[PDB]
Amino acid sequence: MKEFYLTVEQIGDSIFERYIDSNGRERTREVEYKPSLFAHCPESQATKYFDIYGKPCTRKLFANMRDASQWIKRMEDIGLEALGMDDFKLAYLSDTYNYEIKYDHTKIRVANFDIEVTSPDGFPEPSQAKHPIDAITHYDSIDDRFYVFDLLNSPYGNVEEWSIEIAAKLQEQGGDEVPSEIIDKIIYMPFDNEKELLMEYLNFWQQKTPVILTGWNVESFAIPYVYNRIKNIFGESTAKRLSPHRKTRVKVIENMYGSREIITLFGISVLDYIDLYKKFSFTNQPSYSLDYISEFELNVGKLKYDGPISKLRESNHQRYISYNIIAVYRVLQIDAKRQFINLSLDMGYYAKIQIQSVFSPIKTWDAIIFNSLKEQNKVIPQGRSHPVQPYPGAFVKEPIPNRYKYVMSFDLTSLYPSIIRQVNISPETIAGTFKVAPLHDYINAVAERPSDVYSCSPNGMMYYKDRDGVVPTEITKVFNQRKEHKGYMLAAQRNGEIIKEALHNPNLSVDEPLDVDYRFDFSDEIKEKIKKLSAKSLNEMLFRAQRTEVAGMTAQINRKALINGLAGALGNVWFRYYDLRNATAITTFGQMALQWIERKVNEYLNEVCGTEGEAFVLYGDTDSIYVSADKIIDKVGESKFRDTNHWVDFLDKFARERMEPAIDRGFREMCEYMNNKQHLMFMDREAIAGPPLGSKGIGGFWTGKKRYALNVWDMEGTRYAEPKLKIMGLETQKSSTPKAVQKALKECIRRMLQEGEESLQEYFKEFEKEFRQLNYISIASVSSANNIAKYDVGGFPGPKCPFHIRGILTYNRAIKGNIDAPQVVEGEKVYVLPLREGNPFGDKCIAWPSGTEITDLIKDDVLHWMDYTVLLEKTFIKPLEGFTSAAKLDYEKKASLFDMF
DNA sequence: TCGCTAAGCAGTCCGCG
DNA sequence: GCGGACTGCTTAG
Ligand SMILES: Nc1ccn([C@H]2C[C@H](O)[C@@H](COP(=O)(O)OP(=O)(O)OP(=O)(O)O)O2)c(=O)n1
Ligand SMILES: [Ca+2]
Ligand SMILES: [Ca+2]
Ligand SMILES: [Ca+2]
Ligand SMILES: [Ca+2]
Ligand SMILES: [Ca+2]
């Protein structure tokens, strides 16, 4: 096989590399790598190395990496550019793996672990590690085994061995319901004392040294706790055995308002799953506890136990160990679904970076661009310091707040990467500048043509047309990979809809789900067989279709995230190719594009309708426009349509056959106007929306910018079995909105869009009447909690104290003198509830850690004093008032003359 | 929360005769 | 009460 790296590190003048050799074996080596860097040189000096601007360079080969680093410093001292890859491990990877890396995940040791620490006096601080580690579960991907290290004797209690038999049993049999499919994969090791547990764990670690190390909060908790605990008991040299090169470093992670410490383990790639999830999932969650995320992702119930976690080991050690094992498995289950590890490996190996660098788009693109340029013997420029300066972004049209009955949306494909490729935007393709007219003059095609030679953006920039820049070349490669995965995602989605349709008529028979590839549209044969299947087989197929869609989503959305990240990195001062001229060339071109095409669509539709100056485009944001289709529908007349699907087909055909060709013509003219290198403004129909035929539904509404709701029948070619609400920006979409309130507001919107005013009034009356019965957690607001200390003046709110922070201060007073009570953690999320006048907490609200029940110490009082009235007005009534006012609708029936009978 | 801009709403403080 | 200046937070893209 082709060899591939696992990890790479620089330690002084040595590169330490763990890799898979040509026989599939894991190896380690120390290489005394001599790096090269570059200086500009005279024309007369014949060279094969040129900087990105075509200026000649001489290569300087250093005796060692420290010499190269010293040279960089001296060049700064002199005031001359030191060119080349200054991150020597990336240069090493480039030299050692000079080909597209083909990797084999089955040879990469992926370790998933979780530790337990019993702590009487509150949260066990990983920098102190003052409490024994009493359980470790460590899953190894190569062995496919869960290794359980169980401490039976502790100063906090001696316990009996954990029983796998009881663990397997149902909760209803007194068991722990450890999933049967992992029961045979558990390797249980009880220990008489902590020292032998930890020593054996290190020997195990040495035999089975993780390459990728993950779990939940492993970087912020488990890793530093294990390191520091071993350090405290045995000394530093023993703790450093967690590194295959015996090198570790305390790394201080700084933010706006403080800092924290993590432990860097040289020769290991830590990908904490909580951070992979935050980066790659595109969710914003009210809580990031593993129980909360597992419930959300997997629909598995919360792990239930009695008493506080600090007494679980002594009261129920059996459950304590079982829950440690389940915790590790939950993460593997999330990954089986989301496939973020697979994604990280794909991106890391593509860029030729340390796998953990996937968290940094700057580092990822730096390595991609470096490798690409190196292929042509070109030399990368030195990074420079730049002051942070704001720059303009996208255009967002101000909508007229209203109901909108029939709506068709159109969307530019991968806008910013397409702009980059179209205009040819790159550090080395800058050709010069032209005199800019106001943007509106370009939008209306009245400004002078920028250039007859170069490719232009309306910010005043001109670019070469003879050859692609490195940024367009490399962005195109990832754009093209994404396209394939988006295709699989959309096919799986369409396939899902076929199964949902068939589920209306399940057959009374015993059968199996079909063995099919959900990444490809079902053939007619598969479709025939589906129509004959039972509900059991159909639901199983639906689950699989949906899992395939998720896999496609992960692969495609994060590839999109990376290429959009390149556009954004051009405006980050730490990027090697930072240039506000280029960053702004992209965004300003985007503003023109959207407003240019708005004008073109209005002009086209006014022509077909035989009108003048009517606004068909009701809204736009960045890369999309929303077109009112009422007049198109009315031109044939609603009576002419057999059903909803009939007018959806008609609008689908109108968009594809009439509007898209008109949009294309409009954008080709714009390309010529800007003299761009290649026309790549591809704007396709996105959504078709409206009320069910013959209903009183309003179809859609806008309240303002980035705030709207549509009843959608077709999205990007997916024809839904049932209409889907597309709600953007409204309170139903915000993690801050109470769970039950999101749900109620969503149903109010559904009724508005699908059924009309009377249906809405019916539901509102019932909700208002019954909501006081809702569970307190379901009606609590959520907020991130920053700067708690800043606003804390002797336990009371300081000037300008935010509402959620006030609530935390209230909580803190109420739990004062309890080392046991859960503490609110700076920077994390809290639930927030309002309190009625004259309550014993002495303030108008209380807040406690999100994803948890409030402590029993005060729960009864909180429930008794909760202000339901304030809760309802603020979270439900006020947003609903916004929705209905915009839609020109009433949520309460107004009095009429009919009331007199 | 270690790892692009536009823009919405909640809440504080205080003016507005 | 509402709105503007301001902080804080969370969206859409
Ligand atoms: N983090 C982000 C997100 C978006 N955008 C900009 C660039 C995008 O091109 C544009 C629209 O983003 P979308 O994700 O809505 O869709 P794209 O057009 O990028 O991709 P698709 O091909 O899915 O339409 O907004 C950005 O600069 N940075
Ligand atoms: Ca735990
Ligand atoms: Ca788009
Ligand atoms: Ca599209
Ligand atoms: Ca059937
Ligand atoms: Ca869009």
Side-chain angles (χ1 to χ4, degrees):
Chain A
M1 77 188 296
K2 287 257 80 70
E3 310 201 342
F4 61 98
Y5 69 90
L6 296 166
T7 64
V8 65
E9 301 286 0
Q10 178 186 350
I11 303 170
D13 287 328
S14 280
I15 291 294
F16 286 83
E17 189 201 3
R18 293 170 72 200
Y19 69 102
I20 297 304
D21 69 17
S22 43
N23 294 317
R25 274 99 173 251
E26 179 171 338
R27 306 278 297 278
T28 313
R29 59 184 165 206
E30 188 185 344
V31 181
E32 295 180 272
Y33 179 64
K34 301 229 271 260
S36 288
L37 297 169
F38 299 81
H40 290 122
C41 65
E43 185 87 338
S44 61
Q45 197 149 225
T47 182
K48 67 173 176 182
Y49 310 102
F50 298 87
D51 78 7
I52 66 175
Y53 307 104
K55 312 230 78 171
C57 288
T58 175
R59 184 163 68 91
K60 286 170 177 282
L61 192 262
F62 298 92
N64 49 65
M65 291 181 281
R66 282 160 180 172
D67 278 355
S69 289
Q70 288 303 105
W71 184 76
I72 292 166
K73 296 219 315 301
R74 295 328 148 224
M75 290 291 279
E76 181 179 344
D77 289 345
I78 301 162
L80 291 165
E81 185 180 7
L83 297 90
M85 177 49 68
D86 56 309
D87 188 345
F88 304 126
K89 69 184 92 66
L90 297 181
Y92 172 85
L93 288 176
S94 195
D95 283 331
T96 311
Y97 300 96
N98 195 13
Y99 47 86
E100 182 167 52
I101 288 160
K102 161 98 167 192
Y103 74 93
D104 177 356
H105 80 91
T106 71
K107 314 279 198 198
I108 303 169
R109 198 174 295 276
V110 184
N112 281 236
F113 86 118
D114 182 70
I115 75 169
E116 302 299 333
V117 180
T118 293
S119 177
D121 49 20
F123 186 80
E125 289 297 354
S127 61
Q128 313 294 129
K130 62 180 191 175
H131 305 106
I133 293 160
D134 52 34
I136 306 177
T137 298
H138 180 119
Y139 173 87
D140 181 287
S141 73
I142 289 174
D143 292 351
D144 188 30
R145 295 294 183 269
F146 300 80
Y147 294 90
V148 182
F149 302 77
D150 182 12
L151 180 59
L152 305 181
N153 305 325
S154 160
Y156 307 137
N158 295 353
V159 294
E160 309 300 330
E161 286 187 19
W162 165 86
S163 165
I164 191 148
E165 298 90 346
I166 289 164
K169 287 179 186 173
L170 294 162
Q171 296 263 328
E172 293 86 357
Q173 290 172 288
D176 304 314
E177 278 170 34
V178 174
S180 54
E181 74 272 9
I182 69 161
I183 281 298
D184 293 343
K185 301 190 190 180
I186 296 163
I187 293 171
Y188 176 69
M189 296 158 288
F191 296 89
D192 196 70
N193 61 86
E194 195 196 2
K195 279 167 187 153
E196 76 175 16
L197 184 157
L198 289 169
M199 286 187 300
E200 183 57 43
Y201 190 64
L202 287 170
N203 291 150
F204 161 87
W205 190 279
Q206 201 149 314
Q207 285 297 305
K208 303 178 194 286
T209 311
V211 168
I212 306 300
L213 185 62
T214 184
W216 203 258
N217 283 312
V218 289
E219 193 181 66
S220 58
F221 180 77
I223 293 156
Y225 204 99
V226 173
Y227 181 82
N228 285 317
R229 185 67 179 172
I230 292 172
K231 187 168 91 78
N232 290 346
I233 296 166
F234 300 100
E236 270 205 319
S237 74
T238 299
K240 290 173 183 291
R241 291 178 51 209
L242 294 171
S243 165
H245 316 307
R246 311 296 181 253
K247 193 177 175 66
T248 67
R249 192 171 292 177
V250 174
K251 189 185 181 175
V252 52
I253 304 306
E254 297 193 331
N255 61 48
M256 207 140 50
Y257 313 108
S259 67
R260 56 190 187 87
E261 294 186 339
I262 70 170
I263 304 302
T264 299
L265 305 171
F266 279 68
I268 292 166
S269 288
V270 173
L271 309 179
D272 197 332
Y273 217 90
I274 193 172
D275 297 324
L276 293 176
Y277 189 91
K278 281 171 183 178
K279 184 187 170 61
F280 294 135
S281 78
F282 288 88
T283 62
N284 198 0
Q285 300 288 12
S287 165
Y288 288 90
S289 77
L290 184 50
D291 278 81
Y292 195 96
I293 301 297
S294 292
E295 163 96 291
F296 179 90
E297 292 292 323
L298 306 171
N299 282 305
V300 292
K302 194 187 72 182
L303 274 343
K304 278 218 71 182
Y305 57 91
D306 308 325
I309 217 275
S310 59
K311 291 167 181 171
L312 185 54
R313 187 178 165 273
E314 68 166 315
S315 59
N316 200 338
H317 172 256
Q318 174 65 42
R319 181 140 291 170
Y320 190 79
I321 296 301
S322 279
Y323 283 10
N324 178 235
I325 295 165
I326 288 165
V328 174
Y329 187 42
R330 290 317 190 215
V331 179
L332 299 165
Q333 290 184 109
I334 293 158
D335 195 56
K337 175 186 181 191
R338 289 287 199 151
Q339 299 174 192
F340 296 154
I341 297 290
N342 177 72
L343 175 71
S344 303
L345 297 173
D346 279 356
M347 287 173 57
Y349 283 120
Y350 182 79
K352 299 174 178 170
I353 54 178
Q354 298 189 122
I355 306 303
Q356 67 268 36
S357 290
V358 300
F359 286 111
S360 169
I362 288 166
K363 181 64 75 180
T364 304
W365 280 115
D366 198 43
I368 290 168
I369 293 165
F370 155 63
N371 278 284
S372 185
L373 289 168
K374 181 173 156 282
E375 285 264 52
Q376 305 150 251
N377 298 320
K378 294 178 179 181
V379 179
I380 70 173
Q382 190 177 20
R384 284 156 161 86
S385 63
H386 310 273
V388 176
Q389 282 182 300
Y391 69 96
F395 170 81
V396 186
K397 182 182 171 72
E398 189 77 66
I400 295 162
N402 208 344
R403 61 179 77 177
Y404 292 92
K405 193 178 184 194
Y406 294 102
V407 173
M408 277 195 300
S409 69
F410 297 78
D411 173 66
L412 283 144
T413 296
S414 184
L415 182 62
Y416 282 12
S418 296
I419 294 171
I420 281 166
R421 298 166 65 208
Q422 165 147 343
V423 184
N424 197 31
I425 294 162
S426 206
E428 85 284 22
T429 54
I430 295 164
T433 62
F434 66 89
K435 276 159 68 170
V436 309
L439 190 70
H440 275 96
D441 289 352
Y442 296 109
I443 290 159
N444 294 307
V446 294
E448 197 192 331
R449 191 160 184 260
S451 176
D452 247 322
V453 181
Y454 302 116
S455 164
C456 301
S457 173
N459 80 324
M461 292 295 289
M462 312 194 294
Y463 300 88
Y464 298 141
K465 291 186 82 173
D466 66 312
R467 53 181 166 89
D468 281 338
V470 65
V471 162
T473 301
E474 295 306 315
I475 216 174
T476 301
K477 288 172 195 185
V478 180
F479 168 72
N480 281 338
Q481 296 170 24
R482 187 229 172 180
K483 209 181 184 182
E484 171 187 355
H485 294 287
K486 194 177 171 179
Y488 302 155
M489 186 195 72
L490 293 170
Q493 191 180 95
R494 297 186 296 266
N495 284 338
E497 293 310 307
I498 299 169
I499 299 159
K500 291 178 197 180
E501 294 274 18
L503 272 161
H504 302 324
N505 297 105
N507 297 51
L508 292 165
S509 49
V510 172
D511 48 32
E512 292 281 41
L514 268 41
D515 184 20
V516 295
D517 191 339
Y518 297 91
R519 301 175 302 164
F520 301 95
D521 288 292
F522 291 152
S523 65
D524 295 337
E525 189 180 17
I526 291 155
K527 275 189 262 192
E528 286 309 300
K529 293 179 197 172
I530 278 171
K531 287 182 179 181
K532 292 175 186 183
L533 288 174
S534 68
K536 178 154 146 59
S537 289
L538 288 170
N539 284 132
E540 182 54 42
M541 289 190 68
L542 183 57
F543 174 84
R544 296 175 185 177
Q546 289 174 160
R547 279 293 167 100
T548 303
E549 187 185 342
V550 172
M553 174 62 94
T554 296
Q556 78 85 15
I557 205 167
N558 292 295
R559 283 176 175 81
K560 177 191 82 172
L562 183 68
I563 55 173
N564 286 346
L566 183 52
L570 293 166
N572 183 292
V573 303
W574 300 98
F575 192 43
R576 192 181 302 270
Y577 310 100
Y578 171 80
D579 198 330
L580 248 33
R581 292 174 303 172
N582 287 343
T584 301
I586 295 161
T587 66
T588 312
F589 188 100
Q591 291 216 10
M592 176 188 67
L594 199 66
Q595 298 172 85
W596 173 284
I597 210 70
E598 167 184 23
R599 180 181 55 91
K600 289 285 185 177
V601 168
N602 281 339
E603 286 175 358
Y604 177 75
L605 289 172
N606 269 285
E607 191 180 321
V608 8
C609 294
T611 40
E612 193 187 324
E614 314 295 335
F616 286 88
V617 178
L618 65 105
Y619 181 72
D621 182 341
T622 310
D623 71 326
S624 68
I625 54 160
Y626 289 75
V627 185
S628 174
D630 294 12
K631 284 168 164 55
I632 303 306
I633 292 293
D634 289 354
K635 268 188 162 59
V636 338
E638 272 170 320
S639 301
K640 274 67 161 61
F641 296 112
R642 289 176 275 95
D643 49 26
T644 303
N645 207 61
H646 191 194
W647 69 254
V648 175
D649 283 339
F650 166 75
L651 289 184
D652 174 57
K653 195 181 183 181
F654 186 85
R656 188 177 59 258
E657 299 187 351
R658 301 297 165 195
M659 291 188 68
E660 280 177 29
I663 291 171
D664 296 337
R665 285 192 305 273
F667 275 131
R668 284 193 286 275
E669 181 176 273
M670 197 187 78
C671 185
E672 282 165 355
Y673 186 32
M674 290 298 108
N675 197 26
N676 295 143
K677 187 166 183 294
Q678 200 191 346
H679 163 68
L680 288 167
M681 292 301 95
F682 303 145
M683 171 171 259
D684 296 333
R685 191 272 290 172
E686 190 163 57
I688 293 165
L693 220 210
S695 68
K696 303 173 181 173
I698 67 168
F701 69 88
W702 264 258
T703 83
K705 289 184 182 178
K706 297 181 192 287
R707 284 182 65 86
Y708 63 93
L710 296 164
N711 191 53
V712 180
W713 303 90
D714 198 288
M715 182 71 170
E716 283 184 282
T718 297
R719 187 69 55 95
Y720 299 124
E722 303 292 344
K724 197 142 92 75
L725 303 181
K726 176 177 175 63
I727 306 163
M728 307 311 304
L730 307 188
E731 281 71 11
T732 56
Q733 310 311 109
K734 292 161 68 85
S735 63
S736 45
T737 306
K739 264 285 149 68
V741 172
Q742 290 172 334
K743 188 179 153 71
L745 287 175
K746 193 178 174 168
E747 176 64 13
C748 287
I749 294 166
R750 189 199 67 77
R751 290 171 172 257
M752 283 167 75
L753 306 196
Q754 295 178 357
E755 291 162 21
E757 191 179 48
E758 197 183 16
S759 174
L760 188 245
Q761 295 171 173
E762 258 202 22
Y763 197 73
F764 172 84
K765 191 189 285 163
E766 208 62 61
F767 190 75
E768 192 183 41
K769 186 145 45 196
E770 317 290 348
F771 87 102
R772 295 162 195 83
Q773 307 153 219
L774 286 161
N775 179 266
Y776 79 109
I777 287 166
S778 81
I779 51 175
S781 299
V782 179
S783 184
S784 294
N786 297 309
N787 287 288
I788 301 166
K790 192 224 275 200
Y791 291 103
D792 186 343
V793 182
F796 291 92
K800 223 157 286 174
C801 184
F803 191 84
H804 61 292
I805 303 303
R806 181 182 290 270
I808 291 170
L809 295 176
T810 306
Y811 177 79
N812 290 355
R813 294 196 305 278
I815 70 158
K816 206 204 310 300
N818 271 275
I819 331 286
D820 47 285
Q823 297 293 127
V824 174
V825 181
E826 169 68 19
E828 283 175 43
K829 296 183 180 194
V830 286
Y831 287 132
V832 185
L833 284 175
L835 268 15
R836 288 198 314 277
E837 190 97 305
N839 72 85
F841 297 96
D843 220 332
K844 62 174 181 181
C845 60
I846 197 166
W848 71 103
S850 74
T852 70
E853 292 276 346
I854 199 163
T855 182
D856 281 320
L857 297 171
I858 55 172
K859 181 176 176 177
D860 296 335
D861 291 313
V862 173
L863 296 174
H864 185 263
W865 287 98
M866 280 175 78
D867 198 330
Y868 290 98
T869 303
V870 161
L871 203 157
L872 192 69
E873 287 293 341
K874 280 157 49 165
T875 64
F876 184 71
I877 312 291
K878 201 173 179 187
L880 189 61
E881 171 63 37
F883 304 167
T884 56
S885 172
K888 308 188 186 302
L889 224 41
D890 291 311
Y891 63 91
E892 287 178 312
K893 187 177 178 179
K894 39 155 198 171
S896 82
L897 271 66
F898 253 70
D899 304 338
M900 300 199 79
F901 293 84

